[PDB]
Each structure stands twice: as C-alpha cells, then as structure tokens.
Write an enzyme that holds these catalytic residues in place. Structure first.
Site, PDB file in Angstrom:
ATOM      1  N   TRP A 241       0.872  -1.147   0.000  1.00 28.85           N
ATOM      2  CA  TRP A 241       0.000   0.000   0.000  1.00 28.85           C
ATOM      3  C   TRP A 241       0.923   1.213   0.000  1.00 28.85           C
ATOM      4  O   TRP A 241       2.126   1.074   0.261  1.00 28.85           O
ATOM      5  CB  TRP A 241      -1.039  -0.043   1.145  1.00 28.85           C
ATOM      6  CG  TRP A 241      -0.523  -0.092   2.547  1.00 28.85           C
ATOM      7  CD1 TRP A 241      -0.300   0.971   3.328  1.00 28.85           C
ATOM      8  CD2 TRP A 241      -0.225  -1.262   3.367  1.00 28.85           C
ATOM      9  NE1 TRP A 241       0.133   0.575   4.568  1.00 28.85           N
ATOM     10  CE2 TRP A 241       0.196  -0.787   4.615  1.00 28.85           C
ATOM     11  CE3 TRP A 241      -0.266  -2.647   3.160  1.00 28.85           C
ATOM     12  CZ2 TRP A 241       0.561  -1.637   5.677  1.00 28.85           C
ATOM     13  CZ3 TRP A 241       0.121  -3.511   4.235  1.00 28.85           C
ATOM     14  CH2 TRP A 241       0.521  -2.992   5.463  1.00 28.85           C
TER      15      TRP A 241
ATOM     16  N   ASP B 181       5.825  -4.803   3.223  1.00 30.30           N
ATOM     17  CA  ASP B 181       5.960  -5.706   4.354  1.00 30.30           C
ATOM     18  C   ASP B 181       7.202  -6.563   4.146  1.00 30.30           C
ATOM     19  O   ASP B 181       7.694  -6.689   3.019  1.00 30.30           O
ATOM     20  CB  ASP B 181       4.736  -6.603   4.461  1.00 30.30           C
ATOM     21  CG  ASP B 181       3.475  -5.851   4.864  1.00 30.30           C
ATOM     22  OD1 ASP B 181       3.574  -4.827   5.572  1.00 30.30           O
ATOM     23  OD2 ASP B 181       2.377  -6.288   4.478  1.00 30.30           O
TER      24      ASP B 181
HETATM   25  N1  LIG Z   1       0.897  -3.942   6.585  1.00 27.46           N
HETATM   26  C1  LIG Z   1       0.224  -5.138   6.814  1.00 27.46           C
HETATM   27  C2  LIG Z   1      -1.038  -5.150   7.720  1.00 27.46           C
HETATM   28  C3  LIG Z   1      -1.733  -6.526   7.889  1.00 27.46           C
HETATM   29  C4  LIG Z   1      -1.069  -7.614   7.929  1.00 27.46           C
HETATM   30  C5  LIG Z   1      -1.667  -8.728   8.056  1.00 27.46           C
HETATM   31  C6  LIG Z   1      -2.938  -8.763   8.181  1.00 27.46           C
HETATM   32  C7  LIG Z   1      -3.614  -7.691   8.153  1.00 27.46           C
HETATM   33  C8  LIG Z   1      -3.009  -6.564   8.012  1.00 27.46           C
END
Ligand SMILES: *[NH2+]CCc1ccccc1
Ligand SMILES: *[NH2+]CCc1ccccc1
Lengths: 110, 360, 120, 360
Positions: free
Chosen positions: C49, C68
């Site tokens: 994102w 991530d």
């Molecule tokens: N930036 C990741 C946020 C997230 C991870 C895993 C599950 C939901 C949200």
C-alpha cells in the site's frame, strides 16, 4: 470452585483447566480428543481427609484454550519418573498432538 | 529507497543470545528470539511451530531447531523434524526427518543436545516410551533409537569425550552411551545408584564441568557424577544448607535452575524459602553461589523471580530468565554483579542460551 | 529528516515518526531490520500500500511505499495502526487492513515499513 | 471411577451462542473463533483457524464455515487456501474445500466472507492483489465461479430479499450487483449509478443492512443508501448524521464493523468520536449514536466503551459491541440501548463478533 487452581483435584495440573474451556472436569470440550495416556497425581481431599489418585488426561487436537492456566506441582517428579511428570505434553501420542486443555480425572483412593 | 532482504544479523556472534519463547498461550507459534545481551537490542528470530526446541551448533555457524508440524496443524499427518538454520542469515537450510515421537515439553537443555565433537544431535524421544534419538548432522539423517535408555530421561553430554553422553535413569543411576563414528551405540555403562528417586529426587539440570557434573535435589542436597575415568563414579549427598537455611526451609526451585563456572568451580543455584511438597518450580527468591570444592556458600543475591539460567565460561557471565525478562550478570568474582535487564524478551520462555564463542 | 539510519533509533521506532503515517503492523526497524531492510530471513513484498506523509522537518510531502517483510511469524514489536489518508479496499493500493505479503512465496506477515519513494 | 470422554456437543442452545473471531494478530498463525454464551458470558468452545482465519455460521444454523491459509511448513512450503465446513454443535471439522491461492488476507470485516441468502453458496473476496469474488458451492464442496466482473471492487453485501444475489462496492463509487444461478455461476449482473465520491466522501464498507436496502456511512459523517427492492439498485445520499452542534466538535464515525440496523424500527447504530480529522476513521467509539433512518435524525446517544465493531440480532433485539478484547451485550428493544453485561477477555485481538443465526 472447580475453575480455580486451588480446587483440591487440580494439585498436579500444568495447563488450562478444561472446565473453563467449554468442557468439564471429566469431559473434553467439543471437538477435542482425550489423551489415552496421562500423568498421575495424588491429591488430598480437604473434605473427607483422604488422598485420591487423579489422572491428568489432556484434551487434544485443538489449539491452546488459554483460560484458567494452572501450574501446580504437588508430588510431581521429573521425567525419570515419567508418569508423575507434568512438563511434557500428555497429548504426545494422540492422532493430533496439539495441546488444548487438561482434565483432572478421579481414579480412586490412593 | 528500496527495501532489500538477504541481510545478516547486525551485531556480531559474540553479542548474541537465544531466548526460546514457547509462547505457551499460542504454542503452535513458538519461536527463538535473538537478542544482543550487551545492549538489549532485538536482532531477529527463528520460527519454530509447535513447541520448538533450540540449540546452536558447537562451531557457532548454525542454529538447530526441533519441532512438530501437521499437514493442517490440528489435523493431518505429523512431521517431527530437526531444522538447520544459518546463524548469521537466520534462514532455513535443511530439514531432517525424525520418527513421530520427539519430546514435546518444556525447554530443559537436556532434551535437545549434541555430542562434544558436534557431529551428532542427541535428542529425547517419548512415545510415551522413552528412547534417545541420534541425528547425523552432516548426512542429514536419523541414525537410530537408543532403546537402552528406556526408563531414563534427558541428555548430559560428556565434554571430555567426542561422542559420549549420559542420561538419568529411573533406578537413580546414570547410563552412559558411547557412539561410534556412524552414530550407533558402540558401548554403554551403568553407574551405581547416585540418588534415591523416592527420598531425594534430583533436578535433571546438570551443573556441568569438563569431566564431572553436579546435580541438586528437591531438598537442597548435591550429588555428583565424575566421568574423568573409564566408569562414572557417583557421590553425594552434601547439603547446600546450613542450620539457619534449614530452619527457614530453603530449597532449590526452577527449571534450568543451575550453572557451573568451570574455572572457579562455583555452582549457581536458584533457591527459595518455605520449601515444601510442590514448591520445586517456584521462582527464585535468591541465587546462591557455592564453591563446589570447599562445599560452602560464597554468595547470595536477590533472585528476581528467575526460573532458568545459563553460564558463559568464556566471558564469565550468567543469564537468568523469569519467563519474560533476561538479567545479565558478571560472575568473574564470587558475588554476581547485575549489569542490566532485558525486558519483554519473551512471552513464555524457560530457556536462554549464548551464541558459542570458542569452547574447543 | 530523510535519513532514518542517521536519526535516533527511538525516534524512528516510534509510530509518530513522520513517514510512518499509514502503517498497520510491527515496524521492521524494531524487529532486527531497519526502515529499508528486512530483518534477516524475511523477504520484501513486491507489492504494497502507498500514500503521502508530510515531513514537518522540511515542510514537504513525500510518497511512501509501505512494504511488508514476509515469510516469518509476527515480529510483535513496535505495533502501529496509523491511518493518514488510508482508504478502504475499493481504493485498494491506499488500503492497510490487508496483508501486503499476500502475493509472496510465503504470505506469513513479519513486519512492515515505510520506504521513501520521492516528493508527492 | 471417572472416565474422560470426547464427542460432546456445545452445552448451551444455539440461540445463546456468539462467535468472537480472534485474529490473535500477535501470533496470527493461531487465529481462532471463540464461542460464547451471551446470556451469561460462559466460554463454550472454539474452532482453530490457522493464519488470519475468517468465519461465518451457515444461515440454517447447522454449520460453521471458516476460511484460512495453510502452508506445508507454515512459513515455507506449498500454500493451501481453503474453506472448511465444521459442525456447529460438535465443533468438529467435516470438509475442506480448495480455493485458488488468492483468498483475501486481511482484517475481519463481515463483507470479506459471506453467503447467499438461501445459504447454498459461500461468497468470498479474493485479492492477488487483483480483486475478484469467489463462489463456493456448499453442497458440492467445490469452488465453482470466479467473478472477474468485480475487479476493482471490494466486499460482499448479500441482498436479503433474493436467494442468490449480492452487491459489491466499486472504484467508481457505484455498486455492482451479481445474481447467481442455481449452479453458482453468474446468471446476470447490473451496475448502479454513482452513489458516493470516492475521493471527496469515502464510505466505510460496512453496511447497515435492511431486507431491501443498505445504508452506508462516510468518513465525514454522511449517509448513503442503496435500495434494491427492484432489479436495478437505486442509490441516494448524502444526508448528514450531524447537526450544527455536532459539527462544532468535529464528530465523525470511526471503527471497523462500525454500523448496524435494527430492521423493525429502522434504527441505525453508528460508532462516533469527536475531534475527527484525517486519519481518525478507525478510532474507538466515544459514543454510539442511534439514528432514525426514516426521519434522518439522531434519537439517542450513549457511551461507546471504546468499541470498534458491532453486530445486531434482529429477533432478540440485541446489539453486541467489541473493543478488541471485550464484548458488550445491549438490549435494543427500545430506542436507548441498555447494557446488560460485558464479557471480559473474549479475545486478544478481535474486530468481529457474530450471533448464531436463529432465522433459518
Ligand atoms: N501492513 C500489513 C497489515 C496486515 C497484515 C496482516 C494482516 C492484516 C493486516
Ligand atoms: N498437561 C501438560 C500440558 C503441556 C503441554 C505442552 C507442553 C507442556 C505441557
């Protein structure tokens, strides 16, 4: 009273009490499987003054219940006296070894 | 900027400790947390699925884990494994298949060990029949069960021999196993009875020297096993306790509850007052430091509710662990000195270990 | 202000650090990595994102890519849930309630970060 | 003597049961559904859901459906995305249904894992990260359709007045309606006119769902509606939740599953907080507002207890609210909700609670 770690039967429980997990002291919560093996305790009954053998069977095949964690050690002994020992997973021989909760099954007088 | 992977641990090996987090509340997501003991910095982690166990290779290059998988976690086929991970990259390298009976239980050191020469991993099995499993690390193979150890428990390597270890047996004696170069049993011997299982049960955690090991009992006695010669010679008890100690019912308690500083012969032991049946796993009110030669106590300091410890011979340190926090002590002198506490190192850990430095 | 590796770790490890303005997860810089490096043995996401954060130190707006690191279980440290300019899944690449590890070889979420792309 | 037995059913009647989806984000590979009795707070059982599980109960009340992801070795190996069917009373696994490896991994909004009104098809959100809607035939135990028409849209809003129809919110600010055939394949579709400005007044995805219309709240406190009493959905709005006094203190909605509708009265329930500004759309509730959707005016406001998510039971006139860990039970038979009890520690990290269905 049964959901407390001080309940007289729970004198060698290391785990989550099944009676807090949707089961009872002698019934596994729905969808968890009894262990055919257990560690054994000798616990003193404060009401009749007598000692009783308790079989600490686990219920298995579901992830940790998380409720009513006890770690009581009356007459518990290390792994060289294996069936008196409670730092091992008595679900170890089940079809699924994941530990869910622990029961306190009254076998009889010591 | 660009996000990249492939990086190594930021602090050098000699700074590293391994906190084995059982995460009992969610035991299927146990893990090893890697910390720098010099400053409390979190360095990385290794996932270890259901009730992982961990050790570091004696040569310091690899991390060994032991765990259990199922195809669908709570159902499906069981796979018990040893995994070999690179220490500096914290990456998975190899899986070694075990028979589906590796010990599931709390993280005592002696459940998952290795020979002194580092060629074999030596692990505890329970089906619930007990045996010791031997893994050939280089070959990536399970050799076979040491069924001679039925009725015994835990693995105490002999640091003065390349591939020998002992185990504590239900008769109150020690079984010594000597492996051949293939990992199979070459010879074995049984000691005389060291301790009474009924009257003076010992904690399984050894205070381990190069050629002997000391053990403490539920009642504050000390036993030893000398393996300097052909056969193990056993001795004890001597008491940890003076009259004033006995009067207040001081006894040991903990899990990995002892350590030996080999150069000095000082033994470290977690102790608490008002001992009685059922208090053998109570947190430490104090740490006592004993001279094993003179058999006297040389220090006592606050326990910080610690349950497990480990000793580094090379830097003269002791770590203690209360389940979540790690305390770092300088033990170069008889009285330990507290250097720092690392808060929140784990949610539920009963084992911490240093990254090996030296040790040949 | 633009070089977190030169800043005080306590500043960059905080959820109020200016570039962490739409982070949902555990900051990788608290997890054995840095703001722009995955902790050892975890893998960057190829997708993320995105969004803009204002830099109060230099007064400018910057495009951030919230990648991530993946393939290890939850880091657990320095959890943030900041939502500046975050939007629901019908504006998918501005949305942070999904796992941006979803397309990795292993989708297990480890930690998140905030990669500086350029001026908004 | 006593004997431990298994095979037991949940101890409380279906009508007492609620389902707290615990993401356990700290250890997200061991997410689970906790089953509680809302009448007395008793824990009744649980269903393990591995990594980031989602959950719903079949419309007929007989089965629990979960959606999750496995890997052969959790953090490595082959990925399996699945729907599982579990018995509701025994809390036992019955069937796995294979999905393509693109099921949505994300927080537990209701609209990511739904079913047709007739209960014959499960309707789930995919993200690869390209979006589509997946259809599972429950009877056949098969994934039968992939609605690529829904690319660029998000979440599933079933139409309660049709057997196999649902809507999704699209990037144009309109709604796509999908009507499935009795085989689960798309039978027809339609696209509404634009309902809201994506850029200027984004809506929360959570519907306040009536039998034949749905209301949505916006980041800025406006309300939009989609009327599906006919084959073509008619859209309208905005009207403001806010009066002038409310505006002076910058009241706006915030939360996750943040709205609810009591169908008999037309009362809509919304979590609200003051001092709204960019970035506060997921803030806990300072208050719950009760809106009359006919008059478009607030009728009541009560303390929010830091709630983030809610659900409504029509037939017992109840609202549950959830702050992440605790569940509050409210009677909404009258315009002012009355707090009956709080179930403390129902979850570690839950943003979704659901009643067992009693409607059939
Ligand atoms: N930036 C990741 C946020 C997230 C991870 C895993 C599950 C939901 C949200
Ligand atoms: N009854 C013992 C519970 C246990 C499970 C797993 C590991 C140790 C102990």
């Amino acid at each position: 009273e049964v959901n407390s770690c001080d309940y007289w039967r729970h004198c060698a429980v290391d785990g989550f009490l099944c009676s807090c997990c949707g089961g009872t002291t002698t019934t596994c919560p729905p969808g968890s499987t009894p262990s055919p093996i257990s560690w054994i305790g000798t616990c003193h009954n404060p009401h009749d003054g007598k000692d009783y053998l308790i079989s600490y069977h686990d219920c298995c095949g579901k992830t940790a219940c998380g409720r009513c964690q006890c770690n009581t050690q009356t007459r518990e002994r290390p792994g060289y006296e294996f069936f008196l020992h409670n730092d091992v997973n008595w679900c170890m021989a089940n079809e699924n070894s994941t530990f869910h909760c622990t029961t306190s099954v009254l076998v009889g007088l010591a | 900027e660009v996000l990249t992977g492939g990086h190594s641990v930021s602090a050098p090996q000699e700074n590293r400790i391994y906190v084995m987090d059982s995460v009992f509340m969610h035991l299927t997501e146990s893990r090893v947390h890697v910390y720098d003991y010099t400053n409390g910095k979190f360095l990385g982690m290794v996932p270890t699925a259901f009730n992982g166990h961990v050790q570091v290779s004696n040569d310091g290059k690899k991390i060994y884990t032991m765990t259990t998988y199922h195809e669908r976690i709570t159902r499906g086929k069981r796979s018990d494994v040893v995994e070999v991970w690179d220490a500096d990259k914290l990456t998975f390298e190899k899986e070694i298949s075990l028979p589906p009976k590796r010990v599931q239980g709390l993280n005592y050191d002696g459940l998952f060990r290795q020979t002194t020469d580092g060629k074999f991993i030596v692990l505890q099995n329970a089906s619930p029949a007990t045996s010791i499993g031997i893994v050939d690390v280089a070959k990536g193979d399970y050799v076979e069960d040491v069924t001679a150890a039925a009725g015994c428990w835990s693995v105490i390597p002999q640091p003065n021999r390349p591939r020998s270890f002992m185990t504590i047996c239900g008769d109150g004696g020690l079984l010594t196993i000597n492996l051949g170069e293939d990992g199979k049993v070459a010879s074995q011997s049984r000691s005389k009875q060291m301790f009474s299982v009924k009257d003076d049960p010992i904690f399984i955690a050894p205070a381990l020297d190069k050629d002997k090991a000391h053990f403490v009992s539920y009642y504050g006695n000390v036993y030893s096993a000398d393996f300097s010669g052909d056969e193990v010679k056993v001795d004890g008890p001597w008491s940890l306790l003076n009259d004033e100690d006995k009067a207040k019912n001081w006894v040991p308690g903990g899990y990995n509850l002892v350590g030996l500083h080999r150069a000095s012969g000082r033994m470290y032991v977690f102790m608490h007052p008002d001992g009685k049946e059922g208090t053998h796993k109570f947190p430490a009110a104090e740490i006592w430091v004993m001279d094993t030669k003179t058999k006297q106590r040389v220090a006592r300091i606050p326990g910080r509710d610690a349950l497990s410890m480990t000793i580094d011979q090379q830097r003269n340190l002791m770590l203690t662990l209360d389940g979540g926090n790690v305390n770092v002590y300088d033990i170069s002198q008889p009285e330990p000195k507290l250097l720092r506490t690392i808060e929140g190192a784990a949610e539920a850990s009963l084992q911490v270990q240093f990254h090996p430095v030296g040790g040949t």
